Amino acid sequence: MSYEKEFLKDFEDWVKTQIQVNQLAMATSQEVADERAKDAFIRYESKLDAYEFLLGKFDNYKNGKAFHDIPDE
Amino acid sequence: MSYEKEFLKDFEDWVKTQIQVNQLAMATSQEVADERAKDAFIRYESKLDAYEFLLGKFDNYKNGKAFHDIPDE
């Protein structure tokens, strides 16, 4: 793998890590939710949302598509 | 530019776009904040935080550093 390819791979694994990280924090707080727990849930779910979207962009890469293209489902 | 390099460039411009997008929504709602406006501010600031971090990773790329390395300030 070239430098760009390894960078893109580490990048994707990092995103997958953040998704796991936020899913547990999210599930853990949602458990409780008082403004605190809901604020925390919102914080975490907002991050998950951004990372889930990015996971779609890496799918474009693995498919050879341009970045802006819409992922397959 | 190869495919990987153009992908990494579009990727970075997209992140910069999201930062601008969330900064305005964030500033716009914070203006008001009632649980609604604060929940919205939290949502947006949480996304900004994730994107700001990613901007650091692209700096690593532009510097030739591994993904996991810590950006310069």
From TrEMBL, chains A, B:
It comes from the Bacteria. InterPro entries: DUF1912, SPy1572-like_sf. This is Aldose 1-epimerase.
